């Protein structure tokens, strides 16, 4: 009972909820941020050619 | 960090473009443009005859 | 259950087993690449102005 009470006090956020949040955040970074950065890299390469 | 790097890249590109356009304005004055036109006309007439 | 929760969270936070990773490795690699390319663009710009 002491261990269960300690788990409930320490459970905000639920470990399963937290792992889900972590997995969502990881997917968001790959879908939005990584491609944005790739686009910017490509743009910089074009500007070099313009130079 | 991503926003900052994007702003830096855009600023460098605009500087480079500004300086290019300033050099072109210095090179093709109305007097010179008229001469370049005369030279063209003579060259074009030669290309046509040949 | 506790052991499983601990193992799952740890695996997620320590992908290479030895270091706590706060940034997505894929993203960290892109930041570095973008920084390097901007440094090259800045050289070319300085060189042309000079």
UniProtKB/Swiss-Prot annotation, chain C:
Role according to the record: Contributes to mitotic spindle assembly, maintenance of centrosome integrity and completion of cytokinesis as part of the HAUS augmin-like complex.
Family: Belongs to the HAUS3 family.
Shown part of the complete sequence: 499 to 548 of 597
Biological source species: Xenopus laevis
Subunit note: Component of the HAUS augmin-like complex. The complex interacts with the gamma-tubulin ring complex and this interaction is required for spindle assembly.
Descriptive protein name: HAUS augmin-like complex subunit 3
Subcellular location: Cytoplasm, Cytoskeleton, Microtubule organizing center, Centrosome; Cytoplasm, Cytoskeleton, Spindle
């Amino acid at each position: 009972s002491k261990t269960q009470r300690a788990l409930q006090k320490n459970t905000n956020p639920d470990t399963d909820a937290l792992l889900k949040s972590l997995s969502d955040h990881y997917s968001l970074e790959l879908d939005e941020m990584v491609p944005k950065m790739q686009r910017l890299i490509q743009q910089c390469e074009k500007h070099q050619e313009y130079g | 960090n991503a926003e900052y790097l994007e702003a830096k890249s855009n600023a460098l590109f605009l500087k480079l473009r500004m300086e290019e356009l300033q050099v072109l304005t210095d090179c093709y004055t109305p007097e010179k443009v008229l001469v370049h036109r005369q030279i063209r006309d003579t060259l074009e007439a030669g290309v046509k005859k040949e | 259950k506790l052991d499983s929760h601990l193992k799952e969270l740890r695996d997620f936070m320590y992908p290479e087993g030895n270091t706590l990773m706060l940034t997505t490795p894929e993203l960290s690699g892109e930041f570095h690449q973008l920084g390097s390319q901007l440094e090259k663009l800045n050289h070319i710009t300085v060189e042309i102005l000079g």
